[PDB]
Each structure stands twice: as structure tokens, then as C-alpha cells.
Amino acid sequence: MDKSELVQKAKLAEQAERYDDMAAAMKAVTEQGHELSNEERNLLSVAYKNVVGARRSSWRVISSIEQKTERNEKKQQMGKEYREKIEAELQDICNDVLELLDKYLIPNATQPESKVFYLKMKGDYFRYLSEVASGDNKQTTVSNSQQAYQEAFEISKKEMQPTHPIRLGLALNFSVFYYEILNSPEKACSLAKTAFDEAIAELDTLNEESYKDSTLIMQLLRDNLTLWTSE
Amino acid sequence: MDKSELVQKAKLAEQAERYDDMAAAMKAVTEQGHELSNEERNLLSVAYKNVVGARRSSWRVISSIEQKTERNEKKQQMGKEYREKIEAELQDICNDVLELLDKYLIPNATQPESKVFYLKMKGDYFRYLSEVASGDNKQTTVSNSQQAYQEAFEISKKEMQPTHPIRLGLALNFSVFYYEILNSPEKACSLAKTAFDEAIAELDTLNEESYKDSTLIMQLLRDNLTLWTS
């Protein structure tokens, strides 16, 4: 099967709600090593969001049942083994995505918006590993998660306008990450305020017909600031 | 694996909506070769109903797409090839279930309630094969569905109460078989009306444990009878 055929197969699998097929199709597309179109990039992102989402969902369901269980019914030990089977798949799916990002997507990215998309995706997929990571492996995945967002963060700052909706929103994502996962409320606030203020300073340059493309995300940065400072 | 284990695994898979796992667990329980319990029997049924249901839905989605005009020869090829993938899967799923029915479930059925349940199941899964069958495979598969339903129907009339869900569901499915597979509204209406009237003529055979299931399926029978006439 060639790229055109795989892409079509991918859209058919989406329609049929067969997301693993959809993901396998777009994995193979990605492996031709060429920069993906917006259509293709969207398809891959969707494909894997859904495949990863289903196991995450299954895992939340099992963890919850495990904790309502009486703690030596040999049933309890099914929920252990089963959760662990889910986890291993979840990690397998994540490793695929990360391999694609390391090997093809990030290195071939020619434009800064694509490079930032893929770096953030890498950040997101490490975050999913961390949700089922063990003790000492859990700090590794969070650092790997931070570093990917940091790298994307730096590129937006350097290649995009303060007012750009991807830069904002990466600012938002990254600030929330410092707050929610790294327990750093002061860095979280510092980050948000800087993003907010920088875009504020260039409100000047926006078109009255589409300023909300920027303004809506800035409102969220601001909302978080007042929320986080109120604590 | 202990059954209670496999059955547990199966109840978790179900909660987790991982129906392929659920089905494998129940497959390995059925293969231990012993009559299933009402609960293991329902888990096996629910399992395969969801596993095969997902492909029946995917197939239709794709058959419907392949129905719009398509100027692109490669896109038309992929649609054809993808439908064919789903069918092969669908057929494999049905064959698994029919093997289980032939090798274990039906021959070991030791009471009429189960025997009807499994024959009804044999009909259903031969109906699903019919939906994607071709030529002579389709005459065989349709005919096999009718035989198994018909046989179940005779036993359910002879041994079960009119308001029993297994019996009402058989009528439901067998009436739907006649409408959708045999393209015969006359035979589908006659069956559904008989089973409904027979139920309502014996409300005394209702019981608390299955009142909701009985009425739910009676209402579905009714729905179908209105739709099919109007």
C-alpha cells in the first residue's frame, strides 16, 4: 500500500471508528519520512489520541474497581494483572508515537509551527507514560515531558509573534504543567504573566475582525493568574 | 485458569469495554466443556454481541461510503479492500461462535431454556454471516439461520412460557430475520404478532425477576409490528 492508499484507509477507519487501523495506517504514512500535510498530521493526532484514550479510559475504570475491592479476594489479583496488561499496551502505544516523533516528525519539521506541534505531542505522550509509570521511572517521564514542552516553548518564543495563538496556549499548556504536575505555582504564574503581558503589548497589531483568535486564550492565561494568586 | 477467574477477567473486560478480551475469556470458559451458568451464558452472549456488533456497524458505514460516487480508482479500491477486511473479520468471529455452539454449547445443553438460547444464537450468527455472504454461501447461510431459529422456536413454544425473555427475544430476532434477510413482511408480521398476543394472553406468567426484560422485548415486538405495517 502506498501513501495515498494509506491516507484513504486512515479516513475509512476513522469513519468506521476503527482507530487502531487508523493509527497503523498513519504510522506507515509517517514512516515514508516526508513532512506530513495538515490533513495527514491531523489524522495521525486524532488516530493516536483515540487509541491512547481508550486504554487510558480502560485503566481508570480498572484502577477504580481495584480500589473498591476487598484486598485479598483472588478477584483483586485479576484487576492487578489486567490493569498491568492495559498498562503495557498503553506504554507500547506511547513508545510507537515517541519513536515516530524522534525518528521522522520532529527532525524533518521544516516550519516552526510543525516543530512545535510535534514537540508538544512528545510532551503529551510522555505525560501519558507518566500516568502509569512506576516510582523511579515516573520522575524520568515527567522530566522528559518537561523538556519536550520546554523545547517547543523556546521555538514559539523565538519564531512566533507573542500574539500567535500557538505560542499562547503553549504558554497556557506549559504554565498549567508547572502548576499541576511540577507543583511550581510561582514559576507557573511567572510564565503565564509573561505570555499574557507580551501579547497585551502587541494588541495594537491585531485585526478587529479576528482579534479573538488571540484574545480568548489570553483571557485563560489571565483567569489562571487570578485563580492561582487567590491561593 | 479457574472459571471464576476467567469469568472475573470477563466482567472486568466488560466494565473496561474491551469486548475482544471479554470474548476470549468466555471462549476459554466454554472450551472447558461444561454447561455454562445463566450468568456465564449471558457474559458469552454480551461479549460476542459487542465484538460482532462493532464489525456489523463498521461494515455498513463502509458499504454506505462505497455507495457514493467515487471518481478516484485507488479510493474505490481501498473502500472495497477495507470492507473485505471487515467481512473476513466478521466471518471469523461468527465461525468461532458457531464452532463453540456446535462443539460444546448445544450438545451439552441439558435443559430446554439453554437449548433455545443457543439455537437462537446459532440463528443470529448465521444471520450475520448472511449479511455479508455471496452466491451459494448466501443460500446456505440464510437457510442455516432459518433452521436453527425454527428449531429453537418449536422448543420454546413447547417448553417455555410466552412471557419468557429468551422466547420473546427469539421471536424478536426470528421475526427480524424474516423481514431483513428473507425480505418477507408477511412471515415477519405473523410471528411477531403471535408472540406478542401469546405473551399478553398470559400476563400471569410474568414474574418480578424478569418483568422488565419481558415488557422491554414485548414493546420492541410492538414497535416492529407498527413500523412494518405503516
Side-chain angles (χ1 to χ4, degrees), chain A residues 1-48 50-67 69-73 77-98 100-135 137-138 140-208 210-231, chain B residues 1-3 5-8 10-48 50-67 69-70 72 74 76-138 140-208 210-230:
Chain A
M1 273 194 299
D2 63 52
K3 199 151 142 189
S4 304
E5 287 167 343
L6 285 171
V7 162
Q8 183 63 6
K9 183 163 185 194
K11 290 154 166 195
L12 292 175
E14 179 173 39
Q15 292 303 302
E17 303 185 77
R18 294 170 53 102
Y19 290 105
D20 291 340
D21 283 3
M22 191 188 181
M26 293 312 308
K27 181 174 191 290
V29 159
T30 299
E31 291 159 355
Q32 290 310 264
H34 307 125
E35 282 196 277
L36 300 186
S37 74
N38 287 335
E39 190 194 34
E40 291 164 345
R41 168 165 149 277
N42 187 65
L43 284 174
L44 180 71
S45 196
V46 167
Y48 276 103
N50 280 272
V51 166
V52 93
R55 278 71 168 184
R56 288 195 53 206
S57 180
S58 283
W59 184 89
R60 293 193 303 270
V61 166
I62 293 307
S63 294
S64 179
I65 288 164
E66 221 174 359
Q67 299 179 16
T69 282
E70 306 201 355
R71 298 188 193 190
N72 225 3
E73 288 159 337
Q77 191 60 27
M78 303 298 101
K80 224 230 173 218
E81 280 167 299
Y82 204 46
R83 205 193 70 239
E84 289 166 334
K85 180 182 146 50
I86 292 163
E87 288 175 347
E89 281 180 24
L90 202 299
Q91 298 161 30
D92 231 77
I93 295 156
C94 286
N95 294 329
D96 285 347
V97 181
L98 294 158
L100 293 173
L101 295 161
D102 280 20
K103 199 146 165 159
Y104 312 99
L105 300 170
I106 293 157
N108 299 3
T110 215
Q111 230 90 283
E113 169 261 60
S114 286
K115 199 153 195 94
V116 162
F117 188 87
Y118 292 125
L119 281 159
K120 183 195 157 180
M121 199 171 162
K122 181 180 185 178
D124 292 356
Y125 275 78
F126 272 114
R127 206 185 181 188
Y128 297 147
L129 283 168
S130 82
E131 286 173 7
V132 308
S134 65
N137 306 328
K138 182 159 160 154
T140 285
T141 55
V142 168
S143 289
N144 284 230
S145 194
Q146 143 144 48
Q147 201 252 58
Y149 291 136
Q150 180 74 41
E151 201 167 347
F153 173 68
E154 288 171 27
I155 288 146
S156 56
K157 287 193 88 93
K158 171 177 162 165
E159 308 284 355
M160 310 184 168
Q161 328 80 252
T163 231
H164 198 295
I166 298 162
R167 184 164 158 180
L168 300 156
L170 184 56
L172 193 86
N173 289 332
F174 205 23
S175 46
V176 177
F177 184 79
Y178 271 89
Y179 188 95
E180 291 199 338
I181 305 305
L182 302 176
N183 241 85
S184 304
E186 304 93 337
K187 182 55 177 185
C189 284
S190 162
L191 272 159
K193 204 179 160 297
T194 306
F196 192 72
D197 285 343
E198 285 162 347
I200 285 288
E202 304 298 314
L203 282 168
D204 267 305
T205 72
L206 298 179
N207 193 271
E208 65 183 73
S210 58
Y211 68 86
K212 291 183 202 215
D213 291 344
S214 294
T215 271
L216 297 171
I217 302 160
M218 294 163 71
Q219 293 167 32
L220 303 169
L221 291 162
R222 182 86 206 331
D223 285 345
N224 285 346
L225 266 171
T226 56
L227 178 71
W228 297 336
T229 55
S230 73
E231 311 144 7
Chain B
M1 311 255 293
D2 298 288
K3 291 187 200 156
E5 271 186 356
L6 281 163
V7 173
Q8 189 49 57
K11 293 205 190 159
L12 293 173
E14 189 187 4
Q15 293 311 287
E17 289 161 73
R18 294 167 57 85
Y19 301 105
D20 293 348
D21 286 346
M22 189 187 176
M26 291 324 305
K27 180 171 196 285
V29 166
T30 301
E31 282 165 348
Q32 287 182 25
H34 301 125
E35 272 191 294
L36 307 187
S37 86
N38 290 195
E39 176 221 40
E40 297 155 328
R41 186 187 67 201
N42 295 350
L43 298 177
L44 173 66
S45 194
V46 168
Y48 276 103
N50 288 289
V51 169
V52 80
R55 276 75 186 190
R56 295 176 63 234
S57 159
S58 293
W59 180 87
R60 287 181 183 187
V61 174
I62 298 292
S63 277
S64 183
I65 289 161
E66 230 186 336
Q67 199 66 7
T69 343
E70 182 53 70
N72 188 287
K74 272 181 189 185
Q76 193 56 35
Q77 246 313 115
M78 287 313 89
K80 173 150 182 292
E81 268 181 61
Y82 197 61
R83 191 202 76 223
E84 287 171 353
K85 183 177 155 61
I86 294 165
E87 287 185 21
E89 276 184 34
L90 187 320
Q91 286 166 333
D92 278 54
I93 291 154
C94 291
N95 288 324
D96 261 24
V97 173
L98 291 161
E99 172 61 25
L100 288 170
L101 280 171
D102 199 56
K103 200 188 212 304
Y104 303 110
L105 300 168
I106 296 169
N108 288 21
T110 230
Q111 288 167 321
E113 181 172 328
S114 286
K115 193 127 157 61
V116 174
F117 193 92
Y118 295 132
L119 294 166
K120 173 190 165 293
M121 211 180 309
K122 176 158 174 187
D124 293 334
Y125 285 80
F126 270 112
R127 160 161 47 96
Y128 305 155
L129 280 183
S130 88
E131 284 170 336
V132 298
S134 55
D136 296 350
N137 193 69
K138 183 148 170 156
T140 322
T141 265
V142 166
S143 172
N144 287 172
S145 186
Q146 191 152 2
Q147 242 184 112
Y149 283 133
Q150 190 54 37
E151 172 156 20
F153 188 68
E154 285 158 19
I155 301 169
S156 84
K157 280 216 69 166
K158 183 172 160 77
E159 301 288 353
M160 292 178 172
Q161 299 162 296
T163 54
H164 195 306
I166 291 351
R167 175 158 163 189
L168 291 161
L170 173 57
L172 183 69
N173 284 14
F174 195 8
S175 66
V176 170
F177 165 84
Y178 278 130
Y179 196 79
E180 300 183 345
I181 308 307
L182 286 209
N183 187 43
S184 170
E186 304 236 2
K187 289 171 200 164
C189 286
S190 148
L191 189 81
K193 183 180 207 316
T194 294
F196 184 83
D197 289 345
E198 284 178 338
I200 70 176
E202 297 184 45
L203 296 177
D204 57 359
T205 66
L206 288 160
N207 55 64
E208 172 169 12
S210 70
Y211 179 81
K212 298 304 195 322
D213 294 333
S214 293
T215 50
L216 154 55
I217 299 164
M218 287 163 67
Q219 184 62 56
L220 295 184
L221 282 169
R222 151 120 334 285
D223 291 350
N224 288 349
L225 277 166
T226 68
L227 186 73
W228 290 337
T229 48
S230 70

